[PDB]
Design a protein around this ligand. Structure first.
Ligand SMILES: N[C@@H](CCC(=O)N[C@@H](CS)C(=O)NCC(=O)O)C(=O)O
Ligand SMILES: N[C@@H](CCC(=O)N[C@@H](CS)C(=O)NCC(=O)O)C(=O)O
Lengths: 214, 214
């Protein structure tokens, strides 16, 4: 049975959890303490020593969207990728976008003064971009159903909502400024399997709140 | 006939050129001046407004390794990806690695003091990592033949060799310190189609040299 090494609040782990849950693939979750990384983690992710690590058979697969693509080839049911190659490239483009531009959300969490200033601005340009170019008339990035880009961005934007509250004056992701994006994240959290596997906002705010004060 | 928008010295364009050449796919190269970006570029890459842009039919495909994956699905001859899904994830892992860690090479080019200091150190840890974990006993990342990770890293490391000379005291990518990597880049440049489509080092050194002084 496949193994997922990770830890609860990680956006990168929930990407993998969602893909596993969406495909109703059975797995064992291996709780990892990063201040005390198990020998398993150090053996199977020697390059980055990060989680998630996905252990299928004895082979390890490491970066989270890499794992989602792996999971998707090996377990084709409930496709996270379109069949057309242009649509597939489009889906990958927005995953890549989420990974690169989404780093602003995570710098935000640790930023303070003018540094916090800039990442909030950068976070805002990311959203403006997606809001105008990213999500078409279709309900999800993936069409009528959740795709890899929904996974990738869904973790960026939901964690952003929470990181915002944890920082305080976060006038960043405002629903009336970015209505199409808020409609999309609202629908994404509304999907039964995402709904069932979605960390409760309040708990996370406090968690990242008490984490930021330190 | 497919269109490739780009400009000569760009590592990201040569990724696409190599994939096109390796598959003997015919295309038109559209020279782009980035200080004066054509309306075509602004229309088909509104999100980043960067090159390369690959125009197949009327559809644009934008980030360079995204384009290589597109080219590879649409033109399956001379496969750049393995058939096994684990090997495929492995190949993607090292592409992703090249893209993330390779940014050190490109910060180097613009760095000066302690800033240059750090990126040279970071560049060195990237190489140490690949040198020990990246390339197995097999000749290429892709096995007996060039794969996507060879493409991705091949552009990082060759441009690094050149950027090194352009900066001066670059004691970074030393052949005796990283012999397995030097064997690999040596073999990569030795491949007939890469050899034929490889910017001449001397010209590029000067180009990046005169570019750095400014
Ligand atoms: N898989 C993620 C990276 C995941 C990641 O960065 N995880 C952190 C915590 S969420 C970690 O495991 N270790 C952080 C460290 O030790 O530097 C990706 O797509 O790049
Ligand atoms: N496709 C590349 C990015 C290519 C890129 O950054 N190109 C630069 C020059 S090599 C550009 O077109 N524009 C730079 C700018 O205008 O900011 C990728 O894989 O991210």
């Amino acid at each position: 049975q496949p193994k997922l090494l990770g830890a609860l609040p990680s956006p990168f782990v929930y990407r993998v959890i969602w893909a596993l849950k969406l495909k109703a693939i059975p797995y064992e979750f291996i709780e990892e303490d990063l201040t005390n990384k198990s020998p398993l983690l150090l053996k199977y992710n020697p390059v980055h020593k990060k989680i998630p690590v996905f252990l299928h058979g004895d082979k390890p697969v490491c970066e989270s969207m890499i794992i989602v693509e792996y999971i998707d080839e090996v377990w084709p049911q409930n496709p996270l990728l379109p069949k057309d190659p242009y649509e597939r490239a489009l889906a990958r483009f927005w995953v890549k976008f989420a990974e690169d531009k989404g780093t602003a959300v995570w710098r935000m969490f640790r930023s303070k003064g003018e540094e916090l200033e800039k990442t909030m601005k950068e976070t805002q340009e990311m959203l403006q971009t997606v809001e105008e170019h990213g999500i078409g008339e279709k309900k999800f990035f993936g069409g009528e159903s959740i795709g890899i880009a929904d996974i990738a961005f869904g973790s960026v934007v939901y964690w952003l909502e929470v990181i915002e509250e944890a920082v305080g004056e976060g006038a960043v992701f405002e629903a009336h400024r970015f209505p199409r994006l808020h409609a999309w994240i609202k629908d994404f959290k509304q999907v039964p399997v995402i709904k069932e596997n979605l960390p409760e906002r309040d708990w996370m705010v406090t968690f990242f709140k008490n984490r930021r004060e330190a």
